[PDB]
Design a protein around this ligand. Structure first.
Ligand SMILES: Cn1cc2c(CC(=O)N3CCC[C@H](C(N)=O)C3)cccc2n1
Ligand SMILES: [Zn+2]
Length: 139
């Protein structure tokens, strides 16, 4: 579980989006596993505008925050699931670390702010969906 709240937007994993999320849809991308919905109230998360490759992510399966070294956003192969068949997810960042399916939503953050959210995992590699390119989240 977990979202990013910035201004009048709510950023979630598209595979965990609610009915209300789709009823107030701003933008979605299957290939990225992202969905943005509009909010009545105002969020106050700072989205990082950077090219960092180190951060700290929240892992609900361990109730801990872990420091990781992660790859630059790219097209990584992700195996089939009940939400998507076998495909190449884009804007994906991998790091060596623990993750479980319920961990999707946990924020990854650097000194500059929010980098992305947990999206994939398995084999001791946790995958984060990048959001630093979505400049429209701030205007
Ligand atoms: C965070 N996390 C998800 C895990 C899974 C499942 C997984 O990766 N996915 C299922 C949900 C949709 C995801 C996507 N974006 O396509 C793929 C299995 C083991 C460990 C995990 N750690
Ligand atoms: Zn940064």
């Amino acid at each position: 579980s977990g979202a990013i709240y910035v201004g009048n937007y709510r950023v979630v994993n598209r595979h965990l989006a609610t009915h209300n999320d789709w009823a107030n849809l701003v933008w979605e991308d299957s290939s990225r596993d992202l969905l943005v919905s509009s909010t009545t109230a105002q969020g106050c998360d700072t989205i990082a505008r950077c090219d960092c490759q180190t951060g700290v992510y929240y892992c609900s399966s361990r109730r801990k925050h872990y420091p990781v070294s992660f790859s630059k956003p790219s097209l990584i192969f992700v195996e089939a699931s009940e939400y998507y068949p076998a495909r190449y997810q884009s804007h994906l960042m991998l790091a060596v670390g623990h993750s479980e399916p319920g961990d999707c939503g946990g924020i990854l953050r650097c000194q500059h702010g929010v980098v992305g959210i947990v999206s994939t995992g398995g084999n001791g590699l946790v995958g984060f969906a990048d959001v630093r390119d979505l400049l429209w989240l701030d205007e």
